[PDB]
Amino acid sequence: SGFRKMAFPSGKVEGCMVQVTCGTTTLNGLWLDDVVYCPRHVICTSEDMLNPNYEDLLIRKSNHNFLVQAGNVQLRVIGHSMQNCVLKLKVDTANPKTPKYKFVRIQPGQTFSVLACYNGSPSGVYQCAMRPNFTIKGSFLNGSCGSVGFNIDYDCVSFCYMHHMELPTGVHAGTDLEGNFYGPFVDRQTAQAAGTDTTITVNVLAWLYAAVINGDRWFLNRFTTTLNDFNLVAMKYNYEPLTQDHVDILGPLSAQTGIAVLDMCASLKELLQNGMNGRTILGSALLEDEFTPFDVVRQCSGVTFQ
Amino acid sequence: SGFRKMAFPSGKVEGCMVQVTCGTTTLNGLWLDDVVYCPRHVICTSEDMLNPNYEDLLIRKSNHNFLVQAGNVQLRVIGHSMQNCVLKLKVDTANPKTPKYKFVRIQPGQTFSVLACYNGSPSGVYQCAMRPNFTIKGSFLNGSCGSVGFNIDYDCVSFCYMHHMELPTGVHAGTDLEGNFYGPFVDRQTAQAAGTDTTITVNVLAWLYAAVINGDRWFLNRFTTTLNDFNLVAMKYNYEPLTQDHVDILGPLSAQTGIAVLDMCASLKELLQNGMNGRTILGSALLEDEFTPFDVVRQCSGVTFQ
Ligand SMILES: *C(=N)[C@@H](NC(=O)[C@@H]1[C@@H]2[C@H](CN1C(=O)[C@H](NC(=O)C(F)(F)F)C(C)(C)C)C2(C)C)c1cncc2c(F)cccc12
Numbered sequence: 001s002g003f004r005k006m007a008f009p010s011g012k013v014e015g016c017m018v019q020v021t022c023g024t025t026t027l028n029g030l031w032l033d034d035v036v037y038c039p040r041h042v043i044c045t046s047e048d049m050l051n052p053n054y055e056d057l058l059i060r061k062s063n064h065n066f067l068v069q070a071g072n073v074q075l076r077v078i079g080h081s082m083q084n085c086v087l088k089l090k091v092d093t094a095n096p097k098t099p100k101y102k103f104v105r106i107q108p109g110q111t112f113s114v115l116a117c118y119n120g121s122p123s124g125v126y127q128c129a130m131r132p133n134f135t136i137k138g139s140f141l142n143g144s145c146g147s148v149g150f151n152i153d154y155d156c157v158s159f160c161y162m163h164h165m166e167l168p169t170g171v172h173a174g175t176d177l178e179g180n181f182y183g184p185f186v187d188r189q190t191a192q193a194a195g196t197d198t199t200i201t202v203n204v205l206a207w208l209y210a211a212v213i214n215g216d217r218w219f220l221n222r223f224t225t226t227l228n229d230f231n232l233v234a235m236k237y238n239y240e241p242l243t244q245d246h247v248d249i250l251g252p253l254s255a256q257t258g259i260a261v262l263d264m265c266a267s268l269k270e271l272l273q274n275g276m277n278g279r280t281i282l283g284s285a286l287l288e289d290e291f292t293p294f295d296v297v298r299q300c301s302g303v304t305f306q
Numbered sequence: 307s308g309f310r311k312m313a314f315p316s317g318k319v320e321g322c323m324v325q326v327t328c329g330t331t332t333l334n335g336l337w338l339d340d341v342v343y344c345p346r347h348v349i350c351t352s353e354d355m356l357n358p359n360y361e362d363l364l365i366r367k368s369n370h371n372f373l374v375q376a377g378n379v380q381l382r383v384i385g386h387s388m389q390n391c392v393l394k395l396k397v398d399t400a401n402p403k404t405p406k407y408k409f410v411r412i413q414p415g416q417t418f419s420v421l422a423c424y425n426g427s428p429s430g431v432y433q434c435a436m437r438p439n440f441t442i443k444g445s446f447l448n449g450s451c452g453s454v455g456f457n458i459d460y461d462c463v464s465f466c467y468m469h470h471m472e473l474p475t476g477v478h479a480g481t482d483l484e485g486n487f488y489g490p491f492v493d494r495q496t497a498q499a500a501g502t503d504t505t506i507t508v509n510v511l512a513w514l515y516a517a518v519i520n521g522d523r524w525f526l527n528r529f530t531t532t533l534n535d536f537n538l539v540a541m542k543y544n545y546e547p548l549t550q551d552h553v554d555i556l557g558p559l560s561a562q563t564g565i566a567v568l569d570m571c572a573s574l575k576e577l578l579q580n581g582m583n584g585r586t587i588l589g590s591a592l593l594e595d596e597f598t599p600f601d602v603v604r605q606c607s608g609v610t611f612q
């Protein structure tokens with residue numbers, strides 16, 4: 001038992017991280033087969049950041065303008081191209097550590113592990129959710145651009161995120177690995193800002209089920225609710241609507257605990273309307289929304305990865 | 307910016323995990339050079355758990371009674387011995403993935419990363435602290451015994467923990483890698499229980515410094531306090547005493563923020579006496595005590611590992 005914000009083992013991703021330098025800008029790249037992926041703003045100067053024409057900037061570069069270090073060993077760049085907001089640096093060596101992988105784009109509300117990286121050297125690993133407003137509450141300093149987010153299914157790494165930029169509120173924005181931004185953000189200096197967020201209702205319910213599995217029951221009650229009555233309360237507290245598909249996804253957890261989904265919704269309604277009265281749930285005095293139903297089943301059942 | 311409970315990259319440890327089977331008991335082992343380390347209770351039956359004489363049980367075993375799987379490849383056991391509460395299984399192959407390592411024992415209050423494992427297959431990674439009562443608030447199911455805890459310094463893995471057992475409150479007990487238990491726990495079935503815990507005061511102060519670095523300042527005040535006056539308040543709230551060495555360790559953080567350590571103590575005193583009044587700090591409505599001053603400097607400065 002127990003419940004922790006748990007990331008996937010990072011080893012398969014560690015073997016892909018490299019350091020990309022262009023001019024006086026160094027950041028991280030992702031080395032899969034013979035291609036290094038990195039944010040295209042690596043080619044920009046400080047004044048270029050202001051209003052860049054990336055096609056213009058790139059045509060003026062050469063393969064030799066890109067320095068790629070894989071550990072203490074240089075990789076020769078033999079081609080370059082731009083795909084949306086990522087650069088693809090063609091290298092003369094396939095990464096022997098390339099795991100089985102996919103490039104997938106995730107939904108707001110879904111979670112992933114981040115391998116934070118500096119100078120192509122991995123620094124730490126942690127678990128994130130894609131917020132409904134398409135930002136992530138990460139932990140990133142200067143030089144972390146090009147660190148990636150991922151999930152692991154059996155032996156296959158599904159890459160979903162590449163870090164590009166920090167927004168003024170201290171949250172983070174980036175792209176999928178095809179170079180398409182999550183949310184309405186661009187890789188140039190504007191006054192761009194996150195915009196309003198909401199709480200991920202289905203994830204809160206999953207976490208309440210995790211708590212029951214782990215022995216916190218004080219928030220349970222005999223009452224129930226209809227889906228609509230619940231969603232009227234959720235809207236008032238800036239929670240997103242709960243769908244019948246969310247209810248179905250919560251079925252297995254509902255069955256293992258014997259608490260009907262709609263009964264849990266009654267409990268959540270009471271918690272939103274009354275707070276916690278100085279009590280905690282799974283060591284938190286806040287309702288946690290960064291665990292999906294899948295994450296709860298994984299950790300309260302014991303699925304590994306090979 | 308940002309602040310996350312961040313674990314070390316796990317890749318170096320993933321390459322050491324193996325599956326150990328004895329009779330009908332399977333658990334995890336740690337494979338370094340040509341030795342596999344695992345909890346000695348692997349040799350126990352259900353009735354053996356009751357009051358085992360481990361020397362007696364071990365002399366009745368043979369090398370061939372131990373099945374070791376490294377991936378889909380069996381390792382031949384060529385010797386066995388007991389060192390305190392761990393078994394040392396001598397295998398005929400040195401692990402080519404053996405990183406540079408040390409066996410270190412940590413202090414209560416210190417943190418480490420856990421690579422949770424099942425059937426020798428890593429499942430997730432997360433960050434833990436050694437509680438003052440020598441338990442850890444982990445996340446472990448059946449089959450996780452022999453999962454290890456570690457830290458990384460540059461390129462060297464310092465192993466500090468091996469998982470043995472879950473206590474009735476759902477917390478976890480184990481040994482260092484020499485087989486010596488953390489705290490007053492034994493590897494046999496007794497009614498053993500955790501015993502009273504306290505909050506790690508120096509870690510809370512470090513986390514308050516992390517919050518200031520990240521822009522939460524609402525809990526700051528003009529007041530200050532003496533160390534003794536502070537410790538009188540800390541004792542009342544079940545916090546451990548703050549020493550002059552703790553104050554010195556907090557110096558760098560104090561200097562970067564310009565908040566004297568004793569001024570931060572005044573802020574903590576006020577938070578303990580008044581609560582948070584519905585506000586949060588680094589996304590928490592509780593005072594967090596599982597980040598050390600070292601962890602805060604690492605993440606608010608950007609140190610990596612090679
Ligand atoms: C990557 N290593 C770094 N990000 C950038 O350099 C990125 C890049 C410019 C400006 N970038 C930013 O992230 C923002 N700038 C912004 O204009 C905006 F809108 F707020 F996002 C700054 C934080 C530098 C002001 C372009 C968008 C092309 C990076 C990555 N992660 C975290 C960082 C920090 F916390 C601090 C500084 C750089 C960071």
Ligand SMILES: *C(=N)[C@@H](NC(=O)[C@@H]1[C@@H]2[C@H](CN1C(=O)[C@H](NC(=O)C(F)(F)F)C(C)(C)C)C2(C)C)c1cncc2c(F)cccc12
Pocket residue numbers: 001333347355446447448449450451470471472473474492493494495496497498
């Ligand atoms: C390891 N895979 C497993 N632990 C044991 O099997 C371990 C071993 C017996 C009993 N063990 C326990 O962890 C406790 N038993 C206790 O007597 C006590 F005191 F509470 F710790 C049980 C949870 C099984 C009752 C001996 C001590 C020799 C293990 C590891 N981690 C988590 C587990 C669970 F959450 C549930 C079951 C086994 C767990």
